[PDB]
DNA sequence: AATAAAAGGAAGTGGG
DNA sequence: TCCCACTTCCTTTTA
């Protein structure tokens, strides 16, 4: 199945979910996510994925959080937002 | 208090 | 066997 970082890579290349997430600036991979609207995606993520449960934000973020040792994706700074690694982006 | 983001240890599930 | 790549559950901290 398809890994997190590429689902949200995906949506964030196809528009789809414009009003959940978007760039901040996609030279440097950043991206946040709306507080307002992030469920709607996290419940997404989930019903691709089979997941028994319903997905929430709080365990897709808790999933994210593990990216950041081996650099996929890593916590900016800045409420609700994270970067991706130039390996990513390139890949 | 109410709300919310951010965190991670620990144990469970999937598919190798 | 035992790691992959999360998922699920629970508790804590800060704003």
Redesign the pocket.
Known sequence: ?I???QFLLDLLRSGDMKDSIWWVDKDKGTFQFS?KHKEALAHR??IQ?G???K?T???????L??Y?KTGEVK?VK????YQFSGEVLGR
């Not at 934000?57 to 999933?63: L, V």
């Not at 800045?78 to 937002?81: A, P, V």
């Open positions: 199945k890994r997190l970082y507080s993520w989930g994925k997941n028994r449960k997905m934000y709080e365990k897709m973020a808790r999933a959080r593990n950041g916590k800045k409420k609700l937002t």
